[PDB]
Structure formats: structure tokens, C-alpha cells
């Protein structure tokens with residue numbers, strides 16, 4: 603990537619507009635004044651992806667702040683979270699959201715937080731030292747469908763995925779998990795399927 607070795611220091615959330623692709627070309631981003639990457643719920647996202655916005659080829663350095671906010675129909679490709687903040691990426695509004703490539707590390711709690719009905723696919727992705735890979739917002743009963751395809755996880759302190767919704771589903775294909783308490787916390791294990 604042509605921005606590789608550059609560090610971009612930002613002081614506000616980067617807004618990517620509907621239909622646009624923000625291509626970092628390998629830039630590393632370090633956010634200032636947007637949060638400390640703790641579990642405080644009051645930090646800013648590094649990126650806000652409007653519905654139909656895409657993001658690719660960015661390394662997000664510490665502090666991870668509130669990661670990437672996705673408003674739906676978003677492709678997030680080859681994004682590396684060096685040090686996840688409060689959470690890495692949140693689905694804020696309905697649509698399809700795909701994380702393809704990249705990796706995440708050092709998530710004290712969630713990597714992916716799903717706050718609206720969505721189809722959420724994680725493909726060709728690695729994560730190390732995480733609490734949960736995927737959480738549907740606690741105590742909600744709207745439907746998410748999660749796909750984990752070619753995903754490798756190491757050191758999962760809580761679980762791979764958690765939902766409190768009976769109608770939600772998780773499908774996985776080529777999922778490799780090392781050092782994990784419990785793979786899935788859903789109302790019923792029959793919500794979890796391979797393919």
C-alpha cells in the first residue's frame with residue numbers, strides 16, 4: 603500500500619459518504635481527543651460509514667476509541683485494529699455489513715457490536731486477545747444473522763458470539779478457535795449452524 607509507513611493523526615471522526623470508498627492505502631490512523639480506548643461508552647468512532655459507504659486498507663492504531671460505526675450496506679476490507687478500543691465496529695442501522703480480511707487485537711470486551719437487525723459477515727479474519735468476537739446488543743430480540751467464514755480466533759475470554767435473541771442465527775464455515783471458554787451464548791445451541 604502506497605501510504606504504508608505514514609501515520610495520520612485525526613481529531614475528529616472521518617465520515618465516509620454513501621456510495622464512496624475510503625481507501626487508506628495502508629495508512630495508520632491515530633486518533634486524538636476522541637477517547638482513550640477504555641470501556642467508557644462515551645468515545646467517538648474513528649470512522650462513520652454511512653449507508654452504502656465502504657472502507658479499506660487502514661490500520662487503526664491505539665487508541666481504538668469507538669472504532670467503526672456502520673449504518674448498513676457497508677464493506678470493510680483489510681482493516682487492522684492494532685488495539686481495539688471500547689469495541690472495533692458497531693452496526694448502527696439495518697443492512698448488510700461485511701468485514702473481509704484484516705484482524706483485531708486486544709479487545710477488552712467486544713470486537714463487533716450489533717445494535718440493529720442486520721446480516722453480518724466476518725470473512726478471512728483473525729483476532730487475538732478478545733472478550734467476544736460478536737455481540738448482539740444485550741437483551742434485544744430483533745434478528746441478526748451472523749456469518750463467520752475462514753475466521754481464526756486466539757484467546758477468547760468470554761465467548762465467540764453472544765445473543766439474547768431466539769430468532770437470531772450464527773452460521774460458521776472454517777472457524778478455528780484456540781483458548782476459548784465457551785464458543786456460543788445464545789438462547790438455544792440450535793441457533794448455531796455450520797455450512
Ligand SMILES: O=C(O)C1=C[C@H](O)[C@@H](O)[C@@H](O[C@@H]2[C@H](O)[C@@H](O)[C@@H](O)O[C@@H]2C(=O)O)O1
Pocket residue numbers: 711712734737738739740741764
Ligand atoms: O459494551 C458493553 O459493555 C456491553 C454491551 C452489551 O450490549 C451489553 O449486553 C453489556 O454487555 C455485558 C457487560 O456489561 C459487558 O461489560 C461485558 O461483560 O459483556 C456483557 C455481555 O453480555 O456481552 O455491555
Ligand SMILES: O=C(O)[C@H]1O[C@H](O)[C@H](O)[C@@H](O)[C@H]1O
Pocket residue numbers: 771
Ligand atoms: O428464519 C429464517 O428465515 C430462516 O431460518 C433458517 O435459516 C432456515 O435455514 C431458513 O430456511 C429460513 O427459515
Ligand SMILES: O=C[C@H](O)[C@@H](O)[C@@H](O)[C@H](O)C(=O)O
Pocket residue numbers: 643688689692715717739740
Ligand atoms: O443498551 C445499551 C446501549 O446500547 C450501549 O451500551 C451501547 O452504546 C453499546 O454498548 C455499544 O457500544 O454500542
Ligand SMILES: [Ca+2]
Pocket residue numbers: 641688711712
Ligand atoms: Ca464494553
Ligand SMILES: [Ca+2]
Pocket residue numbers: 643688689715
Ligand atoms: Ca459498548
Ligand SMILES: [Ca+2]
Pocket residue numbers: 643668688689692715
Ligand atoms: Ca461502542
Ligand SMILES: [Ca+2]
Pocket residue numbers: 639666685686687707708709710
Ligand atoms: Ca484494547
Ligand SMILES: [Ca+2]
Pocket residue numbers: 769771
Ligand atoms: Ca430461522
